[PDB]
């Protein structure tokens, strides 16, 4: 009946309500070609979208519409929605309701503009905007627990206890997968593997997904890298060329735990989660320590849950029992939560309608959200 559409900054995920996993999965990209006066043969698309842009990557200027969970170009975001509904899902938006997701502490105008596009342009019967962390917690099954959500757009934390979100203890963070990908691309240039153009941005992204892992101890990993060359793995590109890097596997995702490398002057993901828990009430800290949930693609590095356990225990008192909930399906946890929320019978009375939107306007969504 209802459609769930997790508009992620990287991978735009979408499908149906009451499902195990999403059908439509693709990178939210809109590649426009090299505009030269020379002609093109047997016709082509003026602006590609999704997997088509990824396939024909070499030529196209890959521009993401969402930057840090914030929609910059709205015409680009409108084309991706259109690509999700008609091409991938093969179903009109007028029949099915549409669950959407944004990160917490976003601009207030973005929900209003997102909702305006759904009702005016797409003619949706009913829509809703949920917090990503709330859905990630709902996919995991627990009512209680903090959610250290981390995608390519935005890392953020939302502490919740017994089905009561703590909006003032929320802490949004500028560090994310895209900033890690840019950092890996820079340190690759330092060892003679220069990647300037946006076509190579996806190759270094794919290198980041495969090889990189979170260090248990950084100074120890740096010492072993200098001594031995067993850690130095090789990755072959789409092209037959193959490259080898030693230091850059553990050093790339260390930027999460040490933002000083990127030049952000912010708290690391390990202590940002701690600072979120300390901002909550003193009586409900034990359960937040016990249910330290992870979600998103930036939590898919091997050994990240072990590093979070080391750092949070180091920050917190010795008496506390720290525990990180790190499921196998944490990459697609936000969408799974939306599918379970859409499947419930209580959610049928929580939708916005066309008549309610015509009466109120875009400002009705802020009341419905939280």
């Amino acid at each position: 009946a209802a459609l769930v559409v997790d508009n992620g900054s990287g991978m735009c995920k979408a499908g149906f309500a009451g499902d195990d996993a999403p059908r439509a999965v693709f990178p939210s990209i809109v590649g426009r070609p090299r505009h030269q006066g020379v002609m093109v043969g047997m016709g082509q698309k003026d602006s590609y979208v999704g997997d088509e842009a990824q396939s024909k990557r070499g030529i196209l200027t890959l521009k993401y519409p969402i930057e840090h969970g914030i929609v910059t170009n709205w015409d680009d975001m409108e084309k991706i929605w259109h690509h999700t509904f008609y091409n991938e899902l093969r179903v009109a938006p007028e029949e099915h309701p549409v669950l959407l997701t944004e990160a917490p502490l976003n601009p207030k105008a973005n929900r209003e503009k997102m909702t305006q596009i759904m009702f005016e342009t797409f003619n949706t019967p009913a829509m809703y905007v949920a917090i990503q962390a709330v859905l990630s917690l709902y996919a995991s099954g627990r009512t209680t627990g903090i959610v250290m959500d981390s995608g390519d757009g935005v890392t953020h934390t939302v502490p919740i206890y017994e089905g009561y979100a703590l909006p003032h203890a929320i802490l949004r963070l500028d560090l994310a997968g895209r900033d890690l990908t840019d950092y890996l691309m820079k340190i690759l240039t330092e060892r003679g593997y220069s990647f300037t153009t946006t076509a190579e941005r996806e190759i270094v992204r794919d290198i980041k997904e495969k090889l990189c892992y979170v260090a248990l101890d950084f100074e120890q990993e740096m010492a072993t890298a200098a001594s031995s060359s067993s850690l130095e793995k090789s990755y072959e590109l789409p092209d037959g060329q193959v490259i080898t890097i030693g230091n850059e596997r553990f050093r790339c995702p260390e930027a999460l735990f040490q933002p000083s490398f990127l030049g952000m002057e912010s708290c690391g993901i390990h202590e940002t989660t701690f600072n979120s828990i300390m901002k909550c009430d003193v009586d409900i800290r034990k359960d937040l320590y016990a249910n330290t949930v992870l979600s998103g693609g930036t939590t898919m590095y091997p050994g990240i849950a072990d590093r979070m356990q080391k750092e949070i225990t180091a920050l917190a008192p010795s008496t506390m029992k720290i525990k990180i909930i790190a499921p196998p399906e944490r990459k697609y946890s936000v969408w799974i939560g939306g599918s379970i929320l859409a499947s419930l019978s209580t959610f049928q009375q929580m939708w916005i309608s066309k008549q309610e939107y015509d009466e109120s306007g875009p400002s009705i969504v802020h009341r419905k959200c939280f």
């Binding site: 917090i131 709330v134 917690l137 709902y138 009512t143 919740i160 206890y161 017994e162 089905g163 009561y164 979100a165 703590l166 909006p167 909550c280 009430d281 003193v282 009586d283 409900i284 800290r285 034990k286 917190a316 008192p317 010795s318 008496t319 506390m320 929320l341 419930l344 209580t346 959610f347 939280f370």
Partner: protein, 370 residues
């Protein structure tokens, strides 16, 4: 309609409940209404929006707690109606208000308007067959089995001393103060902020009570303890962060003896006990000195009775046998005597029936109590 009557022992700190002819109250829980601070975004949360009893004790951090009674005087009448409804409801008693007669309790010399409005609640909103209101001192002596006795009690709200002699309560010898356990806990909180560790929220306030219950003692000589340097004992929170209490643990209960510390010139516990014996007649004084009974929670401090003896030795006439008695069950002494009073056959004569209340009104309730 003479079913097994209910014994509701009221009080600002704790509210005891149960049936007549029992050894100990089965239903003891703290007297406050808890309502959630935060927003409930996620479904499957703690329903009701009003938390009383063990749910409120379990989920403190969510709830903005507020005490309905201050100094044995209910300020918020809607909150006490909800608590008395919760007492009767299926979560505690599992019985109707229509079946059983009610035994209510109040501190002496309280506002008569509050006693009238209490009766109005039990007769109109609840449909009670018969109500009876009684004193704390008379009930404490019922539990011990005595008739002669000065009852120095110290609850959360009120401290007072009613001198009874062979079943003759002297109303004009009653000495009362509005300085008690809550003010000592509030005074301890103020000291802890001066030490360093700040507590401000209402859920966060009950941690200070738990510190006061556990780690506090009364020094026999306070000037000697001042001149000496303390050891600074530790305490663990529900969070796990350690707190060095210091001299605030011994200086906190000095509010009971020196009420000039809070900045409110009253008599004090020891002076109230002496003044109650002095205001009574000449021949009754020596019997009243021999029978001094203790009750309430703020008599449970370490070295309380030892210091209360020494203060009586300082004030009272020389070469007189002082005996400050104090049963094992001091906290439930008032409830036990009510259960004993309810079980006796004379109880039927003392109460105010619903028919008598409908005919006369408030005047009949004022006549039957005294």
């Amino acid at each position: 309609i003479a079913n097994q009557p209910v014994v509701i022992d009221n009080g600002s700190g704790v509210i005891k409940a149960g049936f007549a002819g029992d050894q100990i109250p089965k239903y003891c829980f703290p007297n406050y209404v808890g309502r959630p601070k935060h927003v409930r975004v996620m479904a499957g949360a703690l329903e009701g929006d009003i938390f009383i009893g063990p749910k409120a004790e379990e989920h403190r951090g969510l709830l903005s707690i507020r005490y309905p009674m201050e100094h044995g005087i209910v300020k918020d009448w809607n909150d006490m109606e909800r608590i008395w409804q919760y007492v009767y409801s299926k979560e505690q008693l599992q019985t109707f208000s229509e079946e059983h007669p009610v035994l209510l309790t109040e501190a002496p010399l309280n506002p008569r308007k509050n006693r009238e409005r209490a009766a109005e609640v039990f007769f109109e909103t609840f449909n009670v067959p018969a109500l009876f209101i009684s004193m704390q001192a008379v009930l404490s002596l019922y539990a011990t089995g005595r008739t002669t006795g000065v009852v120095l009690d110290s609850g959360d709200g009120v401290t007072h001393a009613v001198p009874i002699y062979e079943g003759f309560a002297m109303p004009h010898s009653i000495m009362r103060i509005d300085i008690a356990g809550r003010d000592v806990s509030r005074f301890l909180r103020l000291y802890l902020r001066k030490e360093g560790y700040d507590f401000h929220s209402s859920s966060e306030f009950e941690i200070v009570k738990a510190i006061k219950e556990r780690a506090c003692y009364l020094s026999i000589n306070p000037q000697k303890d001042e001149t000496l340097e303390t050891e600074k004992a530790q305490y663990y929170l529900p969070d796990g962060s350690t707190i060095e209490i210091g001299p605030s643990r011994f200086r906190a209960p000095e509010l009971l003896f020196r009420p000039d510390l809070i900045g409110e010139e009253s008599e004090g516990i020891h002076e109230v006990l002496v003044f109650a014996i002095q205001k009574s007649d000449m021949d009754l004084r020596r019997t009243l000195f021999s029978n001094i009974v203790l009750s309430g929670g703020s008599t449970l401090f370490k070295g309380f009775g030892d210091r209360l003896l020494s203060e009586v030795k300082k004030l009272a006439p020389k070469d007189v046998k002082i005996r400050i008695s104090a049963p094992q069950e001091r906290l439930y002494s008032t409830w036990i005597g009510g259960s004993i009073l309810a079980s006796l056959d004379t109880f039927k004569k003392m109460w105010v029936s619903k028919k008598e209340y409908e005919e006369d009104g408030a005047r009949s309730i004022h006549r039957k109590t005294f």
